[PDB]
Scaffold this active site. Structure first.
Site, short mmCIF file in Angstrom:
data_model
loop_
_atom_site.label_atom_id
_atom_site.label_comp_id
_atom_site.label_asym_id
_atom_site.label_seq_id
_atom_site.Cartn_x
_atom_site.Cartn_y
_atom_site.Cartn_z
N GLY A 28 16.65 70.09 19.46
CA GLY A 28 17.80 70.64 20.20
C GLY A 28 18.53 69.63 21.07
O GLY A 28 18.12 68.48 21.18
N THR A 29 19.61 70.09 21.69
CA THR A 29 20.43 69.23 22.56
C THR A 29 19.72 68.97 23.88
O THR A 29 18.76 69.67 24.22
CB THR A 29 21.82 69.85 22.86
OG1 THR A 29 21.66 71.04 23.65
CG2 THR A 29 22.57 70.19 21.57
N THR A 30 20.18 67.97 24.61
CA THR A 30 19.54 67.56 25.86
C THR A 30 19.94 68.49 27.01
O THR A 30 21.11 68.81 27.18
CB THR A 30 19.89 66.10 26.23
OG1 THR A 30 19.71 65.25 25.09
CG2 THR A 30 19.01 65.60 27.38
N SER A 60 16.52 74.05 25.73
CA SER A 60 16.81 73.28 24.52
C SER A 60 15.96 73.80 23.37
O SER A 60 14.79 74.12 23.55
CB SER A 60 16.50 71.80 24.75
OG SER A 60 17.29 71.27 25.81
#
Ligand SMILES: [Cl-]
Ligand SMILES: [Mg+2]
Ligand SMILES: [Mg+2]
Lengths: 231, 241, 195, 243, 250, 240, 235, 244, 111
Positions: D29-31, D74
Site C-alpha cells: 500500500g501507499t505510505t 496503509s
C-alpha cells in the site's frame, strides 16, 4: 493457485484471488461510460444482446430522484446492490428528510462489499458500478469495484475495451468539465467517449442507453427512439 | 496430515497445535522470573525496546489484573492482551458473584480451563502465551501460579519463563537447596526485588540498566509495578555491595 | 354445546347428543351431530365453546386415524381415552385452553366389553356405566341411579334414555331440539334414525 | 506443509503465516505516517494519482473517530474502513456508559482486541491494513500503530506502507535532534517533507498530499484536516527541501 | 465467527476403527501409572505425583480428587482433560441426582454420567475425545464398595483391582497374584504401595505418591454434629506422614 | 447447524449424490406395479438369503398411506420409513384441512417434493428410494399408478417396475401388457404381476408378495397359498 | 473440496456454469412470440412406452395471463412454479390487478442466486415464461439459473437448442400469425427430436389476451401436425 | 474454512452404499457374538463377553444384556458407550408411551423408534453413526413373543432365531440347521449355548465369559417374567446342557 | 396510564366528477380546546395523479401518508415506472391499514 479456493485466504504475496476473479467478471461485461460537469452528470452504456431475437440487457438502474448507476458484470449482483442503495437513499429521506449524499452512498457500498471479502461461506460481488448524482455539493460521479474500493472522479469507464474511452476522457478533461447548463452537449461528449471502445459493432437505436441527472433535472433514463437524436 | 492443523490427536497421541503454541511463547525473546518473600511476591521481566520511535512507557508484558493479582506474560502481545482482558473480566465477575476477591490460584485454574477448551474444541486455536499469576493471597500467603497453552497449571515456590528459563531455573534451584526454605527470608519487598534482579544477572550473565528491566510487586491488598527510577534505586543498592 | 349423555349396557355403549346450535337468541341449526368416529369401534361425543369443540374432536380423530394406519391396529377405548385426557390436561395450562368436555364410547374387541369414559376440559377422566356433561346429569342421574342394571339390553338402554330425555324436555328451560342417538357395539357404530 | 492455507493455524515455527501474508498487503500500500508533537499528533498520507480524472481533494483517506481521534492506514482500504467503523462503535458505547470521551490507550486496545480476534478462527481473514492513529485525551497526546496480528505500541513517530523505511529514517532524525520536543505547526511541516521524501518509492505516478492534526493549543484537542494556506505552506516547505 | 465445526471429527475408517479413540488410548498409555484395588471393607486408589519441576509445589496439583463424600477419582493421561472432567463430574452429581433425590448418587450411576460426557466428545461436532482413562472408587448403601474404569470411548467396566497408564500390563499381572476376596483395607493399601513401587523410577515417599481410600465414615471430617444419620465422608486422602508410616512396614 | 452442500453439480452437469442414490435403488429388491381395468396390483420381491425370519412381524414391503392408497418401494429400507411417515401425516393433514382424502396424484406429488427438497438442501443427502404409489381417488373407479425417484421426478404408469433386475421385468411387461385391453379382472392382473416377477425372483415360494387394491378402499394382501396357486398354474401352462 | 459460491479465474460461478450443462441434457422446449399471441411447445420424451405420456407436465400455468415451459432437471422447477404462482396471486391481492410478465420473471430470477453454505445449489432447470399484459403486450422471457433473464421474440432451450435457434433465426418475422407460429414450433420440434413427432410425445400451448393461457388437446395438436405434413408436401 | 476438515459422514458411494454405515458394520463384526432364539413359550438371549480378565467383577458387570422395560430386553453388539445412549432413549420412549396410552409399548413400535434415530444419523447432521447392532427380545399381547434386530443403517427385521456381532455367518448356518418351529425354551437355551460354543474364538466357553437371559411366560399365570442370569446360574446351565 | 392515541380534529371531503375529482379539507389542527396551527396541510399530492388525506390522529395520519408515498415510489421501481391506478392504490392502502389490525392507525382516509 492453492490460495484461490475461497475469499478468506490471502496468497503468499498478500493477494485475494477470489476478489481478483470477481474483478475479472467486470472486464468481460459490456462497456459503460460516466462523466460530469459542474451542473450535470451523465451515464452512457452499451447494452448487450444474446442474439438477434433477444432483447438488449438493461445496464442503467435508478436509485432515487437524484441518484442512479450503470452496471458491468453480473447483473443480479447489481440488482442486489442497487436495491440496497434504494433502501439507504430511502432511509435518509424518511428518517432525516434528507437526500443521501453521493459520497456517503459510496461509503455504504464500500462497506457492504467489504463484508463479503473477509468472511467464510460468502463470495465477493461480481459487478462494477458507476454511480452518478446531484446533491447539495453539486454533480458527482463515483466508480465502485467489488473489492470495496470506491473512487470519486470527473469521468471514467468500466467493462470490456474501457481503456479507449478512459483515455479520451483524460484528454477531454478540460473541455467537458466546462459544459455547464447544456445537457445535450455533455451527452454528446459521453457518446463520443463510449465510441472509442467500439469495434465491429456501432451505436444503434436499441443498442445505446443514456442517463442524466443535474441541477433541475431528475434522474431519467433514455432508451429506444429517445437516443436516436444522439446517434 | 490435517491432524497437525487442528487440535485432534495424532497417531502418537499428541496435539501438534498445542506444541507449536508453546514455541510461539518464545517469539518475543524475553525472560521472566518470579520469587516469593515473607510478606510479598516479586516478578521481574526483561524489557527490550529495539526501535527508537517507540514510546517505551507503553511497552509492557506485566498486567494489573485486579488490585491484588498481577500477571506477567511470555508470548506475543496480541495474545497476551487477549488473556489479560479475559482475566480482568473474570476477576471482576468473581467478586460480584461470590462477594470476595478472586484468589490467584482460582483465577489461574479458570484461565487454564479456558485454555483446555481450545485444545479440545477445533474452531478455537490455543493462545501462544504462558501466564504467570502472582499475589499475596489472604489464605495461602505469597503465591505464584503459572498457566500454559496445554491447559496445565501448578503453584510454585519460584519460577522462570522464556528462552533461557533453564539457566534461571537451575540458579534458583541451587539457592533453595542451600537455604532449605520455600521462600526468600527477607522483611522488605525492596530487598526481595534486589534478590530477584541479582539472581537473574547471575543466571543470564548480563548487566541491566534501569530501562532493561520491568518489575512487578505483590503485597497484602495491592499489586503494583515499579517505575524506571524505582528500579534505578534498586540497581544502585545491588552495585554498592 | 348443551346436552351429551352416555350409557354403557351389557353389550354396547349408547351416546345421546343434542341437535341444536345456538348463537345468542337464535337457533342456527336443529340437526347438528356432536360426535366424531375416532376408530371403527370408538365414538367420541363433545360439548363446550364454539370452535374449540370441533377443532379438538377433529384433532383427536386425525391422531387416532394416523395411529391406526401406522400400526394397522385399532387402539383400545382405554388407550384412546388416556390419549384424549393427556391432550386436555396439557391444554388446561396452555395460553388458550380447549373449552371442551367429551364422552368416549367404545367396544373393546379384545375383552369383548363396552366401555364409557367421561372426560371434562380439565383432563378429569372417569370410567362409568352412565355419564353426562354440563347441566344434563342434574336431571338424568336420579333416573339412571334408579333404573340402571349392568345386564340391560340395548333396547332397554334406549327406553331408559327416552325417559331421561323426556325429563330434560319437561324441566330444562332451553330447547335443545331433541337428540341424535348412536350405538357402539361389536359390529361397529350405527345411528338410531328414529328417536 | 499446508500450514499457510488456513488462518489461526500455528506452523511448526509457532507462526501464523496468514497474518504474515496480510502484512504483505500492507507493504504493498501507499505510505502513511504519524508524528507525536508537544501537545498533540499529526497524521499524513500519500495518495497516488492514478489518473487525471481523479477529482482533487475528494477521495479523503484519513478518518476521524469520535471528535478527538484521527485514523490513517496503509494496505486494503476497505479493511481500514471496516476497522474504523468498529472503532466508532467502540468509542460510542464507551461514551454512552462512562460519559467521558474514550482515552487513546483505551481506544487502542479496543481496536487491538478486535484485530486480534480475526487471528483466532479459520472462518475469518486477518486485516490487510496497518493503522496509525491517536489524539489528545485528559493525560495528553498519544500516537499508536496497529498491525494485522493485533499488535500495537505507543510511538514518538510512526510509518507504514511501501515507503516506510525512508519515512522511519526521517522520523528517527527528528527524535534525536529534538529531545525537548516538536511543536504542532513544525510537525505539520515535517510531516509534509517526510511524505515527499517517502514518495521516491512510488515515483512512477505523481501524488496528492493529505494532512490532519489534533493539538491542545492549535485545534482545542479536536481532530481537524489541514486545509488551504496552512496546507500550501507545508507543501512549499516540502518542495523546498527535496530541491 | 460461530463454531462452524458442526460435523464429527471422530469417524469410522474402512477397517472399522475409530481413529481418534485409539489415539486417545495411546495418550493414556504414555501417562503416569495409576491403580485401584477393592477390599472387603474399603477401596484404595493410588498414583505417582510426577512433578514437572522441583520448584513446583506438587501439593497444589491434586491427581486424586473427591467427586462426592463417598466417591473418589484418579486418572492416567492428559491432566487438564482430567481436571475439567472432575469439575463436570462434581456438577452432574448435583444437577442430575442430588437436586432431584436429595442424596448423592451411587458410584455406578455417577460413573454412567461421566461415561456419557466422554462418549459425546467422541460423536458430537467439532471436538476431540478426552485423552484420559479414569479410575473411580466409591461406596453407596445398596451396592457397597465398588471400583470402575472409564475409557476415552465412554465404555466403563467394574474391577476387583486394576491399573492404567505407563506400566499397566506389568501392574495388572502383579495384582492378579496378590488379590483375593478376603483382603482387609490395610492389606489392599500395602499391595497398592508394592505395585506402585515397580513403576516408579526416582524418589518413592509420601511427597511423591498420592493415595486415597474409600473406607469407614469419618465423623471428624464432617464439620458439624447434631444429626445422627449424617456420619461423615467415606472418602479420605492419606497424608504424607501416613504413607511414610506404611512404607516402613513394607 | 450442519449446512454442508452434499448434493452439487459436477462439470458435466450431473448431481452425483442423486445418481448414487439411484444405485441404492438398483440394489434394492424388485417391486412391480400393474393396473387392470378395475384394480391395481403391487408385487414385491423378498430375497431368500434371509431365512429364520419371522414373517408375522417383519416390516411388510407394501405400506398403506391411507385406506385408499398404498406405497411400495425399492432401495434403502430405513429411508423408506421416513417418506412413508411423512406421507401418512400429510394424508391426515389433507383430510383435516380440506375435508377430502388425498388423490393418488396429490400424495405422489407431495412425496416427490420431499425427495426433491433433499437434493438441494444443505447438510442432507438424497433418499436412496424409488416408490410406486397406487390406489383409487375418492368416489372414482379409474385405477391410479405413479412412480417417484430420488431426483424428485414423478409420472403415471400403465405398468412399471423398480429395483434390481427391473430392466428384465420391464422388458417382459412392455411386450405382454396391452393398453387397448388391460387385465379385465383381478385374476388376470395378479397372474400378469406374478408372471413378471417369475422372470427374476428365483423360487416362487415365500419370495413373492402380492397386494391387490380395488376401488372404495378395498385393499387386501394375498397369502402364500393363494400366490402359490398362481405359480403352479403359470408353469403348468409353460410346459408346452 | 471447494466453495459452492466460488468464482473461476475467468470470472464465472462454477456451479452456475455446471447447472447450464444439465439444462443442455434436458428435453427441448420452444417459444415463439407474435402480435396475435405467444406459443409454447415442448418435447415430452417418455423413457418407456408403458409411461402414460399425458402425465408428463412440462408446460404449466402460472396465472391466466402467464404460462411457462421448462427444460432440464424438471423436479427443480416445482418450487419455482410454486413461487411464481404465489407471486402472481399475491400481487393480485395487494394491487387488485394482473402482474406484469417482466415483474413475475424478475421475482422468479431472484431465487436463482440464493444458494450457498438458503438452498445448497443452483436450480438445474431453465424456464420459458410467456404471457401478456396491457403495458408491454405479448412477451416471452428466458429465465436462467444465473439469475439473468432475456426477453425474446423466439427462443429454444434444451438439447436441440442451438440447431432450433438457428432455424428460428431465419423463420421469425414481426408479422407472424398465431397459426403460423403453431406450425413453426411443430416443424422445429419435429426436426430436433429423436423419435417421430406425434400428438402423444409433443405438446403445444398458447397465451392470448382473450382466452388466456391454454394447453392444447392431443386431438387439436394432431390436426396441426396433419396440416403441417400436407403443407411441407405441397412444395 | 472448516469445510477442509469435514469427512462427510452422510454420503453415498458411487455404488450407492453409505460409507460410514458399512464401516460401522465392519466394527460390529469384531464385537462379541450375541444370539437370540424365539420359542413358542418364551425367548432366549445369549451373548459372549469379550476377552475378560480374572480381576473383572462379573456379578456387578453388564456389557451385553440390558433391560428396556419389564417386557422387553436387548442384546448389544458394538460400542457399549454408544449402546447406552440409545438404551436410555428407548427406556424413555417406553415410559412416554405408557404415560400417554396407559398400556405397555408394543415391541415393534419401540424398535421402529430406535431404528429411526439410527437412520437420522445416516441422512443428516454430519455426525458419525452409532456403531451398534441390537437384538430385541420382547413380548406384547398382539404378536406375543418377538425377536428383532437393528443395525447402524436404521434398518430392522423380525426373526425366529438370529445372531449379531462376530461369526454371524457360521452362527446363522448352525441355527438354521437345528431350529424347528415347535421348539421350546429349554431346547432353545441348549441351542444358543451350543452355537456359541462352536463359533467362539476362545479356547473354551465358560461361565465368566457369558451373559444370558430369558423371557418366559413361565411366570405364575398369564404374565411375563424377565430373568437376567447370575454368574452361578450361568455356571449351572452350562453343566446341565453338558458343555463344561 | 399512557394513551397512545389523540384527536387532532379536522374534517375532509371528497367529491367525484364526470372527468375530475376534488379532495378538500380544513387547515386547522387542534388538541382539546386549543389551536395548534391555523394552517397545517392535511391533503397531499402522492404522485401518479392521486391525492390523499388521512384524518383523525395526526401522527398516525402522517405515518400512513408517508408510507403510501413510499409504496408508490417502490411500485415504480419494481414494475418499470408503471402508473399506479386509483383502484390499485386503494387495495394497497387496505393492506397498510390491516397490517395494524391489533394497534390501528386511528384515521379516516380518503383518496
Ligand atoms: Cl471453569
Ligand atoms: Mg482447537
Ligand atoms: Mg369429568
Amino acid at each position: 493457485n492453492n490460495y484461490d479456493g475461497d475469499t478468506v485466504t490471502f496468497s503468499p504475496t498478500g493477494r485475494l484471488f477470489q476478489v481478483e476473479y470477481a474483478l475479472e467478471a467486470i472486464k468481460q461485461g459490456s462497456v459503460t461510460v460516466g462523466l460530469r460537469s459542474n451542473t450535470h452528470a451523465v451515464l452512457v452504456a452499451l447494452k448487450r444482446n444474446a442474439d438477434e431475437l433477444s432483447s438488449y440487457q438493461k445496464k442503467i438502474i435508478k436509485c432515487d430522484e437524484h441518484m442512479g448507476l450503470s452496471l458491468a458484470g453480473l447483473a443480479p449482483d447489481a440488482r442486489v446492490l442497487s436495491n440496497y442503495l434504494r433502501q439507504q437513499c430511502n432511509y435518509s429521506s424518511l428518517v432525516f428528510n434528507r437526500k443521501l449524499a453521493v459520497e456517503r452512498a459510496g461509503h455504504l457500498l464500500c462497506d457492504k462489499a467489504q463484508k463479503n471479502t473477509q468472511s467464510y461461506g460468502g463470495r465477493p460481488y461480481g459487478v462494477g458500478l458507476l454511480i452518478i448524482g446531484y446533491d447539495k455539493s453539486g454533480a458527482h460521479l463515483l466508480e465502485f469495484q467489488p473489492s470495496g474500493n470506491v473512487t470519486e472522479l470527473y469521468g471514467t469507464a468500466i467493462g470490456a475495451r474501457s481503456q479507449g474511452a478512459k483515455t479520451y476522457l483524460e484528454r477531454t478533461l478540460d473541455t467537458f468539465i466546462k459544459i455547464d447548463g447544456n445537457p445535450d452537449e455533455l451527452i454528446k461528449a459521453g457518446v463520443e467517449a463510449i465510441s472509442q471502445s467500439l469495434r465491429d459493432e456501432s451505436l444503434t437505436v436499441d443498442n445505446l442507453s443514456i442517463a442524466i441527472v443535474g441541477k433541475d433535472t431528475p434522474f431519467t433514463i433514455y432508451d429506444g427512439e429517445a437516443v436516436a437524436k444522439y446517434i | 496430515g490435517y491432524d497437525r492443523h487442528i487440535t485432534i490427536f495424532s497417531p502418537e497421541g499428541r496435539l501438534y497445535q498445542v506444541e507449536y503454541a508453546f514455541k510461539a511463547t518464545n517469539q518475543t525473546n524475553i525472560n521472566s522470573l518470579a520469587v516469593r518473600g515473607k510478606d510479598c511476591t516479586v516478578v521481574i521481566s526483561q524489557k527490550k525496546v529495539p526501535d527508537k520511535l517507540l514510546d517505551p512507557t507503553t511497552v509492557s508484558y506485566i498486567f494489573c489484573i485486579s488490585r491484588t493479582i498481577g500477571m506477567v506474560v511470555n508470548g506475543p502481545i496480541p495474545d497476551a492482551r487477549n488473556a489479560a482482558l479475559r482475566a480482568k473480566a473474570e476477576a471482576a465477575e468473581f467478586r460480584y458473584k461470590y462477594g470476595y476477591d478472586m484468589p490467584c490460584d482460582v483465577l489461574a485454574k479458570r484461565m487454564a480451563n479456558l485454555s483446555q477448551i481450545y485444545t479440545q474444541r477445533a474452531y478455537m486455536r490455543p493462545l501462544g502465551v504462558i501466564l504467570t499469576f502472582v499475589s499475596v493471597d489472604e489464605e495461602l500467603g505469597p503465591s505464584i501460579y503459572k498457566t500454559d497453552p496445554a491447559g496445565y497449571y501448578v503453584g510454585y515456590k519460584a519460577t522462570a519463563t522464556g528462552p533461557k528459563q533453564q539457566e534461571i531455573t537451575t540458579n534458583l534451584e541451587n539457592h533453595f537447596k542451600k537455604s532449605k526454605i520455600d521462600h526468600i527470608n527477607e522483611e522488605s519487598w525492596e530487598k526481595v526485588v534486589e534478590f530477584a534482579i541479582t539472581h537473574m544477572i547471575d543466571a543470564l550473565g548480563t548487566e541491566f540498566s534501569k530501562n532493561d528491566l520491568e518489575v512487578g510487586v505483590a503485597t497484602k491488598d495491592k499489586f503494583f509495578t515499579l517505575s524506571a527510577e524505582n528500579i534505578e534505586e534498586r540497581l544502585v543498592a545491588i552495585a554498592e555491595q | 354445546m348443551d346436552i351429551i349423555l352416555g350409557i354403557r349396557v351389557q353389550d354396547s355403549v349408547i351416546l345421546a347428543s343434542s341437535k341444536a346450535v345456538t348463537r345468542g337468541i337464535s337457533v342456527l341449526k336443529d340437526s347438528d351431530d356432536k360426535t366424531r368416529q375416532l376408530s371403527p369401534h370408538t365414538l367420541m361425543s363433545f360439548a363446550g365453546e364454539a370452535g374449540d369443540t370441533v377443532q379438538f374432536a377433529e384433532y383427536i380423530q386425525a391422531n387416532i386415524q394416523l395411529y391406526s394406519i401406522r400400526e394397522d391396529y385399532e387402539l383400545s377405548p382405554q388407550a384412546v381415552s388416556s390419549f384424549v385426557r393427556q391432550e386436555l390436561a396439557k391444554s388446561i395450562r396452555s395460553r388458550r385452553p380447549y373449552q371442551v368436555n367429551v364422552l368416549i364410547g367404545g367396544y373393546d374387541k379384545k375383552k369383548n366389553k363396552p366401555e364409557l369414559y367421561q372426560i371434562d376440559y380439565l383432563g378429569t377422566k372417569v370410567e362409568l356405566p352412565y355419564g353426562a356433561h354440563g347441566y344434563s346429569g342434574f336431571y338424568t342421574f336420579s333416573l339412571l341411579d334408579h333404573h340402571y342394571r349392568p345386564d340391560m339390553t340395548t333396547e332397554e338402554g334406549l327406553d331408559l334414555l327416552k325417559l331421561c330425555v323426556q325429563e330434560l324436555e319437561k324441566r330444562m328451560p332451553m330447547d335443545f331440539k331433541g337428540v341424535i342417538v348412536k350405538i357402539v357395539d361389536k359390529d361397529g357404530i350405527r345411528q338410531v334414525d328414529d328417536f | 506443509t499446508g500450514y499457510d492455507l488456513s488462518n489461526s493455524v500455528f506452523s511448526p515455527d509457532g507462526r501464523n503465516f496468514q497474518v504474515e501474508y496480510a502484512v504483505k498487503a500492507v507493504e504493498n500500500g501507499t505510505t502513511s505516517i504519524g508524528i507525536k508533537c508537544n501537545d498533540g499528533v499529526v497524521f499524513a498520507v500519500e495518495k497516488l494519482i492514478t489518473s487525471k480524472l481523479l477529482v482533487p481533494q475528494k477521495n479523503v483517506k484519513i478518518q476521524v473517530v469520535d471528535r478527538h481521534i484521527g485514523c490513517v492506514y496503509s494496505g486494503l482500504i476497505p479493511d481500514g474502513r471496516h476497522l474504523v467503523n468498529r472503532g466508532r462503535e467502540e468509542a460510542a458505547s464507551f461514551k454512552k456508559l462512562y460519559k467521558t470521551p474514550i482515552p487513546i490507550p483505551a481506544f487502542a486496545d479496543r481496536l487491538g482486541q478486535y484485530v486480534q480476534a480475526h487471528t483466532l478462527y479459520n472462518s475469518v481473514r486477518p486485516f490487510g491494513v496497518s493503522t496509525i492513529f491517536g489524539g489528545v485525551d485528559k493525560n495528553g497526546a498519544h500516537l499508536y500503530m496497529l498491525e494485522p496480528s493485533g499488535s500495537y505500541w505507543g510511538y514518538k513517530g510512526a510509518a507504514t506502507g511501501k515507503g516506510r523505511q525512508s519515512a522511519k529514517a526521517e522520523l528517527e532524525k527528528l527524535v534525536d535532534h529534538h529531545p525537548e520536543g516538536l511543536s504542532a505547526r513544525e510537525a505539520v511541516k515535517q510531516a509534509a517533507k517526510i511524505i515527499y521524501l517517502a514518495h521516491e518509492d512510488n515515483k512512477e505516478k505523481d501524488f496528492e498530499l493529505e494532512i490532519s492534526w489534533c493539538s491542545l493549543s492549535e485545534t482545542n484537542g479536536l481532530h481537524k484536516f489541514v486545509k488551504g494556506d496552512l496546507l500550501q505552506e507545508a507543501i512549499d516547505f516540502a518542495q523546498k527541501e527535496i530541491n | 465467527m460461530t463454531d462452524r465445526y458442526s460435523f464429527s471429527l471422530t469417524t469410522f475408517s474402512p477397517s472399522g476403527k475409530l481413529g481418534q479413540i485409539d489415539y486417545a488410548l495411546t495418550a493414556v498409555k504414555q501417562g503416569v501409572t495409576s491403580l485401584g484395588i477393592k477390599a472387603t471393607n474399603g477401596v484404595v486408589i493410588a498414583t505417582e505425583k510426577k512433578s514437572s519441576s522441583p520448584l513446583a509445589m506438587s501439593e497444589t496439583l491434586s491427581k486424586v480428587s473427591l467427586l462426592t463424600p463417598d466417591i473418589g477419582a484418579v486418572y492416567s493421561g492428559m491432566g487438564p482433560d482430567y481436571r475439567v472432567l472432575v469439575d463436570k463430574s462434581r456438577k452432574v452429581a448435583h444437577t442430575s441426582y442430588k437436586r432431584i433425590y436429595g442424596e448423592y448418587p451411587p458410584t455406578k450411576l455417577l460413573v454412567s454420567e461421566v461415561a456419557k460426557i466422554m462418549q459425546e466428545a467422541t460423536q458430537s461436532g467439532g471436538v476431540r475425545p478426552f485423552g484420559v482413562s479414569l479410575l473411580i472408587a466409591g461406596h453407596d448403601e445398596f451396592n457397597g464398595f465398588s471400583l470402575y474404569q472409564v475409557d476415552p470411548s465412554g465404555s466403563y467396566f467394574p474391577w476387583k483391582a486394576t491399573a492404567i497408564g505407563k506400566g499397566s500390563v506389568a501392574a495388572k499381572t502383579f495384582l492378579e497374584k496378590r488379590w483375593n476376596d478376603e483382603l482387609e483395607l490395610e492389606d489392599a493399601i500395602h499391595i497398592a504401595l508394592l505395585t506402585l513401587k515397580e513403576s516408579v523410577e526416582g524418589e518413592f515417599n509420601g511427597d511423591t505418591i498420592e493415595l486415597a481410600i474409600i473406607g469407614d465414615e469419618n465423623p471428624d471430617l464432617l464439620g458439624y454434629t447434631g444429626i445422627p444419620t449424617d456420619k461423615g465422608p467415606r472418602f479420605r486422602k492419606l497424608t504424607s506422614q501416613e504413607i511414610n508410616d506404611r512404607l516402613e512396614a513394607l | 447447524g450442519y449446512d454442508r452442500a452434499l448434493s452439487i453439480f459436477s462439470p458435466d452437469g450431473h448431481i452425483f449424490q442423486v445418481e448414487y442414490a439411484l444405485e441404492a435403488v438398483k440394489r434394492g429388491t424388485c417391486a412391480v406395479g400393474v393396473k387392470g381395468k378395475n384394480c391395481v396390483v403391487l408385487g414385491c420381491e423378498r430375497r431368500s438369503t434371509l431365512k429364520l425370519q419371522d414373517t408375522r412381524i417383519t416390516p411388510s414391503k407394501v405400506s398403506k398411506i391411507d385406506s385408499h392408497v398404498v406405497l411400495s418401494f425399492s432401495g434403502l429400507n430405513a429411508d423408506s420409513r421416513i417418506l412413508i411417515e411423512k406421507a401418512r401425516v400429510e394424508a391426515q393433514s389433507h383430510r383435516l384441512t380440506l375435508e377430502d382424502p388425498v388423490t393418488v396424484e396429490y400424495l405422489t406429488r407431495y412425496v416427490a417434493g420431499v425427495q426433491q427438497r433433499y437434493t438441494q438442501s444443505g447438510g442432507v443427502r438424497p433418499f436412496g428410494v424409488s416408490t410406486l404409489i397406487a390406489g383409487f381417488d375418492p368416489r372414482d373407479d379409474e385405477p391410479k399408478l405413479y412412480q417417484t425417484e430420488p431426483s424428485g421426478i414423478y409420472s403415471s404408469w400403465s405398468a412399471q417396475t423398480i429395483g434390481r433386475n427391473s430392466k428384465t421385468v420391464r422388458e417382459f411387461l412392455e411386450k405382454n401388457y396391452d393398453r387397448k385391453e388391460p387385465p379385465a379382472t383381478v385374476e388376470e392382473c395378479v397372474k400378469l404381476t406374478v408372471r413378471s416377477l417369475l422372470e427374476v425372483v428365483q423360487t416362487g415360494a415365500k419370495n413373492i408378495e402380492i397386494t391387490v387394491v380395488k376401488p372404495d378402499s378395498d385393499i387386501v394382501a394375498l397369502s402364500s397359498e393363494e400366490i402359490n396357486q398362481y405359480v403352479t398354474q403359470i408353469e403348468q401352462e409353460k410346459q408346452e | 473440496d471447494r466453495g459452492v459460491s466460488t468464482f473461476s479465474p475467468e470470472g464465472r460461478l462454477f456451479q452456475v456454469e455446471y447447472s447450464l450443462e444439465a439444462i443442455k441434457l434436458g428435453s427441448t422446449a420452444i417459444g415463439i412470440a407474435t402480435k396475435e399471441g405467444v406459443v409454447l411447445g415442448v418435447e415430452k420424451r417418455a423413457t418407456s412406452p408403458l409411461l402414460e405420456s399425458d402425465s408428463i407436465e412440462k408446460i404449466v400455468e402460472i396465472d391466466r395471463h402467464i404460462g411457462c415451459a421448462m427444460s432440464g432437471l424438471t423436479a427443480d422447477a416445482r418450487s419455482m412454479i410454486e413461487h411464481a404462482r404465489t407471486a402472481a396471486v399475491t400481487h393480485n391481492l395487494y394491487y387488485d390487478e394482473d402482474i406484469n410478465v417482466e415483474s413475475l420473471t424478475q421475482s422468479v430470477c431472484d431465487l436463482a442466486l440464493r444458494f450457498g453454505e438458503l438452498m445448497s445449489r443452483p436450480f438445474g432447470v431453465a424456464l420459458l415464461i410467456a404471457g401478456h399484459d396491457a403495458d408491454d403486450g405479448y412477451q416471452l422471457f428466458h429465465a436462467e439459473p444465473s439469475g439473468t433473464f432475456y426477453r425474446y421474440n423466439a427462443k429454444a432451450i434444451g438439447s436441440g437448442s442451438e440447431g432450433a435457434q438457428a432455424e428460428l433465426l431465419n423463420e421469425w418475422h414481426s408479422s407472424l400469425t398465431l397459426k403460423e407460429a403453431e406450425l413453426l414450433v411443430l416443424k422445429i420440434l419435429k426436426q430436433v427430436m429423436e423419435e417421430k413427432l406425434d400428438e402423444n410425445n409433443a405438446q403445444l400451448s398458447c397465451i392470448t389476451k382473450q382466452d388466456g393461457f391454454k394447453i392444447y388437446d392431443n386431438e387439436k395438436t394432431a390436426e396441426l401436425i396433419k396440416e403441417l405434413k400436407e403443407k411441407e408436401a405441397a412444395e | 474454512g472448516s469445510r477442509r476438515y469435514d469427512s462427510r459422514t452422510t454420503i453415498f458411494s458411487p455404488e450407492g452404499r453409505l460409507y460410514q454405515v458399512e464401516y460401522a458394520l465392519e466394527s460390529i463384526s469384531h464385537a462379541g457374538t450375541a444370539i437370540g432364539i424365539m420359542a413358542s413359550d418364551g425367548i432366549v438371549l445369549a451373548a459372549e463377553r469379550k476377552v475378560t480378565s480374572t480381576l473383572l467383577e462379573q456379578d456387578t458387570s453388564t456389557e451385553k444384556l440390558y433391560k428396556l422395560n419389564d417386557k422387553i430386553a436387548v442384546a448389544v453388539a458394538g460400542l457399549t458407550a454408544d449402546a447406552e445412549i440409545l438404551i436410555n432413549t428407548a427406556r424413555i420412549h417406553a415410559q412416554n408411551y405408557l404415560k400417554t396410552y396407559n398400556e405397555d409399548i408394543p415391541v415393534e413400535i419401540l424398535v421402529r423408534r430406535l431404528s429411526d434415530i439410527k437412520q437420522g444419523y445416516t441422512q443428516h447432521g454430519g455426525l458419525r453413526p452409532f456403531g451398534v447392532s441390537f437384538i430385541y427380545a420382547g413380548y406384547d399381547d398382539r404378536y406375543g413373543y418377538q425377536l428383532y434386530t437393528s443395525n447402524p443403517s436404521g434398518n430392522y427385521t423380525g426373526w425366529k432365531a438370529i445372531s449379531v456381532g462376530a461369526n454371524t455367518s457360521a452362527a446363522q448356518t448352525l441355527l438354521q440347521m437345528d431350529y424347528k418351529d415347535d421348539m421350546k425354551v429349554d431346547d432353545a437355551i441348549e441351542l444358543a449355548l451350543k452355537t456359541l460354543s462352536k463359533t467362539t474364538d476362545s479356547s473354551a466357553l465358560t461361565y465368566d465369559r457369558l451373559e444370558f437371559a430369558t423371557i418366559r411366560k413361565g411366570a405364575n399365570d398369564g404374565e411375563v417374567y424377565q430373568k437376567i442370569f447370575k454368574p452361578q446360574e450361568i455356571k449351572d446351565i452350562l453343566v446341565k446342557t453338558g458343555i463344561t | 396510564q399512557f394513551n397512545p392515541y389523540g384527536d387532532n380534529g379536522g374534517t375532509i371531503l371528497g367529491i367525484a366528477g364526470e372527468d375530475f375529482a376534488v379532495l378538500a379539507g380544513d387547515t386547522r389542527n387542534i388538541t382539546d380546546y386549543s389551536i395548534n396551527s391555523r394552517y397545517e396541510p392535511k391533503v397531499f399530492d402522492c404522485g401518479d395523479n392521486i391525492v390523499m388525506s388521512a384524518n383523525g390522529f395526526a401522527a398516525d395520519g402522517d405515518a400512513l401518508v408517508k408510507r403510501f408515498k413510499n409504496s408508490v415510489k417502490w411500485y415504480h421501481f419494481d414494475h418499470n415506472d408503471k402508473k399506479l391506478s386509483i383502484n390499485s392504490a386503494a387495495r394497497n392502502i387496505q393492506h397498510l391499514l390491516y397490517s395494524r389490525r391489533f394497534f390501528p392507525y386511528y384515521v379516516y382516509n380518503i383518496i
